[PDB]
Amino acid sequence: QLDVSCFAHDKNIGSRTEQLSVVHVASAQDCMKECQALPTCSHFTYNKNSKKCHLKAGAPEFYTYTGDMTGPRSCEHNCSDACWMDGNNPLAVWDYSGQPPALCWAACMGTPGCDLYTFQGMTCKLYSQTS
Amino acid sequence: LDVSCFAHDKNIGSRTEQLSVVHVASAQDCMKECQALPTCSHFTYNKNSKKCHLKAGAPEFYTYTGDMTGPRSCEHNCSDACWMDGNNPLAVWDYSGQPPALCWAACMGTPGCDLYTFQGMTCKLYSQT
Ligand SMILES: [Cl-]
Ligand SMILES: [Cl-]
């Protein structure tokens, strides 16, 4: 069983990105499985009416098309603040409720190694760039 | 000097070891003292003592009556992905109503993309500086 819960199945959301492969399959889950079998598949569009599963490498190009749903290679990728493809743990994560972001900028200034910060939801996260 | 980005009445101090302490009449004057020292990241000014405590390291917040803790400048108001030296995105796209994983897909699918940010409806792609 693959998780297909992170994207809408009934909003007619397609991607125009050029195909890497096309097959027909019986479910969104099966289309995800086809994506995951291809090293360079980043996302897919499955059509519930035609049963076509279009696997794609490039960045999604969203558009509207009846019966389409567009899913990622996997729903496991749930990072949103600053998210490295190769992985990069924050140097620090603090609750900064009631603080301005400029105090998170101050934290980064004062933290050796800190190249950038994020301040989503008043949480101050510090990061070093990787290499 | 804009001193409005932080609270003045919430008794917020910082324990960070200080660079120095001086006396001043206002938070704005404390911020000025902070800006005169190259390594001052933040300060705690106290309403009652009139002491302005200039600090280099990361804030260490705590509660202390009459304290207020401000940054070197309120102007550093970036809150998404904020590079200390600046960094323009490779790409900025409208991904309203999409899971973060589809922004991950966008970064995977974009040569040069090292990382992404997806707060709100905007999927932003970056290469490292
Ligand atoms: Cl459209
Ligand atoms: Cl690449």
Swiss-Prot record, chain B:
Under Pfam families, the record lists: PAN_1, PAN_4
For this UniProt record, the keywords arranged alphabetically read as follows: Cell adhesion, Cytoplasmic vesicle, Disulfide bond, Lectin, Repeat
**GO MF:** carbohydrate binding
Listed binding positions for a carbohydrate are 14, 55, 62, 67
InterPro entries cross-referenced by the UniProt entry: Apple (IPR000177), Pan_app (IPR003609)
- Gene Ontology process terms (BP): cell adhesion; proteolysis
Q: Outline the extent of the PAN domain.
A: 5-74, 78-129
Q: What does this protein do?
A: Galactose-binding lectin. Plays a role in adhesion to the host cell. Has a potential role in invasion of host cells.
Q: Which family does it belong to?
A: Belongs to the microneme antigen family.
Known partners and oligomeric status: Homodimer or heterodimer.
Protein name according to UniProt: Microneme antigen L2
**The organism of origin for this protein:** Sarcocystis muris
